[PDB]
Amino acid sequence: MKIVYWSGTGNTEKMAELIAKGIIESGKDVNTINVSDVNIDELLNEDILILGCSAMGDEVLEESEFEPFIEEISTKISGKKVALFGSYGWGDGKWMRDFEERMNGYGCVVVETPLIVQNEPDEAEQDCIEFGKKIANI
Ligand SMILES: Cc1cc2nc3c(=O)[nH]c(=O)nc-3n(C[C@H](O)[C@H](O)[C@H](O)COP(=O)(O)O)c2cc1C
Numbered sequence: 001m002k003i004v005y006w007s008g009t010g011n012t013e014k015m016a017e018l019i020a021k022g023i024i025e026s027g028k029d030v031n032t033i034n035v036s037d038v039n040i041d042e043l044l045n046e047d048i049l050i051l052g053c054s055a056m057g058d059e060v061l062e063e064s065e066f067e068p069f070i071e072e073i074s075t076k077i078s079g080k081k082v083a084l085f086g087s088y089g090w091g092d093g094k095w096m097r098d099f100e101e102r103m104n105g106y107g108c109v110v111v112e113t114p115l116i117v118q119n120e121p122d123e124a125e126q127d128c129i130e131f132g133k134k135i136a137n138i
Pocket of ligand 1: 006007008009010011012013053054055056057058059060087088089090091092093118119120
């Protein structure tokens with residue numbers, strides 16, 4: 001499987017590592033890729049797309065790297081299964097509700113409830129691991 005993410009201070013990156021750990025513990029293989037290093041064509045061969053990005057201003061996806069990537073793959077992912085995650089600061093997850101609505105609008109099947117954690121995982125570490133374990137049971 002593959003996990004693609006954008007992280008500005010490392011919070012979503014940490015989430016990505018933990019989710020990967022959960023998938024690996026379930027017996028499966030997975031590679032985490034920062035959005036800057038992604039290859040669209042190889043990504044599109046995946047059964048499940050696990051995408052993460054923190055909440056940027058104001059309650060939107062990061063604009064210089066992540067959004068352009070989402071827009072680029074938007075027309076080629078109808079019918080694909082996707083799982084979403086990301087870290088946020090002071091909001092209540094509005095950016096994630098919009099992210100889910102957007103992927104559904106592109107014809108994707110959002111497989112699990114999006115995983116959102118405030119700031120660095122720390123306390124929510126097992127939660128991140130368990131989310132990966134859920135995706136591995138798909
Ligand atoms: C310019 C900027 C805008 C932000 N806007 C929001 C926002 O609208 N809502 C929110 O809850 N957090 C917001 N945050 C906080 C980040 O989502 C939060 O610090 C998160 O933990 C960052 O994770 P990352 O290290 O993976 O980027 C913003 C942070 C920055 C730098």
